[PDB]
Amino acid sequence: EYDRTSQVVWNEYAEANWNYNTNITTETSKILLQKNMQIANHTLKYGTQARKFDVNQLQNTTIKRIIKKVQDLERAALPAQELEEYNKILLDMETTYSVATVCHPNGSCLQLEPDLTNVMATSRKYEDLLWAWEGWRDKAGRAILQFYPKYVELINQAARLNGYVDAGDSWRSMYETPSLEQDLERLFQELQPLYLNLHAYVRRALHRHYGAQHINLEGPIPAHLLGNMWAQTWSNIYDLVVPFPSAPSMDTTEAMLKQGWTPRRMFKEADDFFTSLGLLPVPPEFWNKSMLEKPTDGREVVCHASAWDFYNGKDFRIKQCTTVNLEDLVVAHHEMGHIQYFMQYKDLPVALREGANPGFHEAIGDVLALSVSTPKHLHSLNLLSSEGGSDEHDINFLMKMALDKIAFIPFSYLVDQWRWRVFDGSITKENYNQEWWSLRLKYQGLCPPVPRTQGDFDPGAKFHIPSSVPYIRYFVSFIIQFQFHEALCQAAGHTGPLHKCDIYQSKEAGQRLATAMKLGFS
Amino acid sequence: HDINFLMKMALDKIAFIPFSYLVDQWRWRVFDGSITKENYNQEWWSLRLKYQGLCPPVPRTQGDF
Amino acid sequence: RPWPEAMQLITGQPNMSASAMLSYFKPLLDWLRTENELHGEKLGWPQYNWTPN
Ligand SMILES: *[C@@H]1O[C@H](CO)[C@@H](O[C@@H]2O[C@H](CO)[C@@H](O)[C@H](O)[C@H]2NC(C)=O)[C@H](O)[C@H]1NC(C)=O
Ligand SMILES: *[C@@H]1O[C@H](CO)[C@@H](O)[C@H](O)[C@H]1NC(C)=O
Numbered sequence: 001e002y003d004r005t006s007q008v009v010w011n012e013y014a015e016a017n018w019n020y021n022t023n024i025t026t027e028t029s030k031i032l033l034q035k036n037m038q039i040a041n042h043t044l045k046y047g048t049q050a051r052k053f054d055v056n057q058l059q060n061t062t063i064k065r066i067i068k069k070v071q072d073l074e075r076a077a078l079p080a081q082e083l084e085e086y087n088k089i090l091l092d093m094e095t096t097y098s099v100a101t102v103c104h105p106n107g108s109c110l111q112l113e114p115d116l117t118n119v120m121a122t123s124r125k126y127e128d129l130l131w132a133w134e135g136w137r138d139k140a141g142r143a144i145l146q147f148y149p150k151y152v153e154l155i156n157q158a159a160r161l162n163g164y165v166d167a168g169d170s171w172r173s174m175y176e177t178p179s180l181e182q183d184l185e186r187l188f189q190e191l192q193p194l195y196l197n198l199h200a201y202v203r204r205a206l207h208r209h210y211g212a213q214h215i216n217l218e219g220p221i222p223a224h225l226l227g228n229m230w231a232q233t234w235s236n237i238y239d240l241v242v243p244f245p246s247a248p249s250m251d252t253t254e255a256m257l258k259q260g261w262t263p264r265r266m267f268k269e270a271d272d273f274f275t276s277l278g279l280l281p282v283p284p285e286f287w288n289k290s291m292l293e294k295p296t297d298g299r300e301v302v303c304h305a306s307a308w309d310f311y312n313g314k315d316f317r318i319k320q321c322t323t324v325n326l327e328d329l330v331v332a333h334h335e336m337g338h339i340q341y342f343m344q345y346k347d348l349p350v351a352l353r354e355g356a357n358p359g360f361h362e363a364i365g366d367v368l369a370l371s372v373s374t375p376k377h378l379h380s381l382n383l384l385s386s387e388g389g390s391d392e393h394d395i396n397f398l399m400k401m402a403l404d405k406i407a408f409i410p411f412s413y414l415v416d417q418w419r420w421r422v423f424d425g426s427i428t429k430e431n432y433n434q435e436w437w438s439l440r441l442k443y444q445g446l447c448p449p450v451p452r453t454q455g456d457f458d459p460g461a462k463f464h465i466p467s468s469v470p471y472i473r474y475f476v477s478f479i480i481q482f483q484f485h486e487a488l489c490q491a492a493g494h495t496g497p498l499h500k501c502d503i504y505q506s507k508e509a510g511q512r513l514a515t516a517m518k519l520g521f522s
Numbered sequence: 523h524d525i526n527f528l529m530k531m532a533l534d535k536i537a538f539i540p541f542s543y544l545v546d547q548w549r550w551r552v553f554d555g556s557i558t559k560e561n562y563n564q565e566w567w568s569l570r571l572k573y574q575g576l577c578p579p580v581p582r583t584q585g586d587f
Numbered sequence: 588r589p590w591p592e593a594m595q596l597i598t599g600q601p602n603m604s605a606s607a608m609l610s611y612f613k614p615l616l617d618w619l620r621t622e623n624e625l626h627g628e629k630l631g632w633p634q635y636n637w638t639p640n
């Protein structure tokens with residue numbers, strides 16, 4: 001009965017979510033609001049029905065897992081007033097963050113996703129980068145701080161009625177790992193040497209460019225002189241940190257301009273590669289039913305989101321649109337992998353339709369993007385790169401590829417470390433910001449470019465802070481996806497330079513991936 | 523007179539309560555491996571600023587202890 | 588014998604109580620709160636990233 005009713009109710013929920021995302025208006029907001037109330041009512045009713053059951057005395061595995069997963073009411077365990085206040089707080093935080101725009105009062109104004117991120121990722125001026133970072137952090141964090149303590153209190157309350165301890169155990173129980181914290185700390189300690197060497201080189205380059213007045217050889221680099229609003233994957237624009245400028249170094253900025261390279265054909269290329277790997281293709285109506293391009297108006301989507309599945313077994317759409325870029329390819333492949341992960345366990349019950357581990361979603365989404373980013377695959381697709389012939393091109397490509405997927409590991413650890421420390425009552429409100437910078441000075445090597453006093457909720461800049469999503473699910477991915485690639489490159493029959501190995505028409509590798517990823521959460 | 527005597531004894535004792543809670547907390551965190559060796563002074567000064575509310579009068583770099 | 592037995596022997600409750608300090612310093616605490624609000628000052632240190640030089 002739970003499966004039968006949940007299929008239709010969640011299909012309706014996801015249809016309403018799509019209608020909001022593509023047609024942002026007042027009617028869509030109201031429809032999402034009262035369908036959220038409806039889904040909360042349904043989940044409360046079915047969780048209460050499940051609580052009359054017992055899971056331990058039951059003798060089975062699949063139904064035992066279903067009952068255990070539905071025992072918790074998540075955010076529906078609150079009373080009427082508390083649940084309503086919590087949902088209103090979440091909606092208000094999301095609204096005041098998505099529409100939050102900081103600008104010079106002269107009249108010209110800029111929004112976060114379209115310009116500000118780009119306006120620093122393409123700029124190399126100290127003052128402009130400082131103004132952008134400071135203004136965004138100030139405005140967004142100050143706006144969020146007015147509500148964030150209430151959300152923390154209410155989510156702790158929800159976890160405590162659910163049966164967990166202060167909303168840290170709740171988010172850590174998704175992994176079913178009692179020793180998760182120690183394991184992740186050990187992983188970060190193991191990754192410390194390479195990351196430290198990379199940070200040393202980056203600080204060398206930044207001191208070479210900006211001089212010594214702002215960045216000195218001894219001392220952490222400022223957090224805004226890296227390329228991102230948050231420096232999660234810093235210096236993805238590496239022109240200032242090029243080891244040696246080489247003739248055969250790839251550009252990958254004009255290879256998708258003179259051939260047209262519309263998002264539709266590029267998504268078709270990604271799907272063709274995925275099919276060549278050896279898994280089932282996406283049904284064709286995805287192409288003619290979804291949106292993957294820029295809109296015809298000024299209102300298209302929320303700032304940033306992920307793939308959307310309607311759990312109906314027919315709709316597997318993708319929302320992301322990022323014009324035309326090289327990083328567009330990596331995010332598109334990420335979303336292709338995520339959607340195929342959503343698709344592969346269609347036959348499983350909708351209760352287990354969540355994936356083996358929140359990290360595994362991004363892991364399988366990004367493993368193929370990692371494999372296709374190699375210069376050999378680019379040589380086989382629209383480009384002429386040195387591949388593995390010249391070692392200098394190989395080390396340059398390794399540096400470009402390790403500016404990402406590394407220097408993101410410390411951030412993906414830090415965000416959820418701070419969130420766990422604040423959820424479990426270890427961090428008092430009065431210094432909500434302070435610890436966040438202390439962690440920035442401990443796990444990462446960043447310091448505040450301007451003295452950040454209390455009253456500046458600097459953790460409010462990240463979208464994942466007010467949206468209530470467990471950022472650490474990315475960390476596991478960025479640690480585990482590489483561990484995937486190795487195994488897949490084993491099926492290729494050759495290892496050699498694993499940093500340049502490629503997966504292409506390796507049918508056995510795809511079969512091995514599918515024989516396990518199909519298990520889902522069962 | 524009562525206020526002056528109370529203030530003197532407060533300076534004596536409740537300005538020492540936080541340091542007593544602080545130093546052994548730092549040592550307990552150091553022994554259990556959570557402070558390692560790269561940052562011995564930074565954790566101590568962060569704890570000072572968190573509990574006792576004191577700041578290093580000059581920049582205290584790593585290697586000073 | 589364990590600590591709680593002795594702690595009850597001196598005082599009467601086998602618990603570490605911080606209310607004795609509060610009642611001891613109550614006149615000073617009240618006077619100092621009154622003086623602080625009269626002088627218009629905020630508690631805490633909401634400029635934590637501050638160093639004299
Ligand atoms: C106990 O678990 C077993 C598997 O270990 C279940 O057997 C299958 O369960 C799925 C749903 O999980 C059904 O679609 C299949 O039809 C079941 N197989 C057969 C041969 O009937 C079993 O259903 C579980 N027990 C209960 C009472 O659901
Ligand atoms: C999108 O919203 C507008 C609001 O005017 C409405 O007219 C239109 O029908 C909506 N689109 C769809 C596909 O329902």
Ligand SMILES: *[C@@H]1O[C@H](CO)[C@@H](O)[C@H](O)[C@H]1NC(C)=O
Nearest residue numbers: 034036037038039040041042
């Ligand atoms: C949810 O169920 C309760 C049961 O008492 C009912 O009062 C309330 O109106 C329901 N809400 C919706 C939106 O159907």
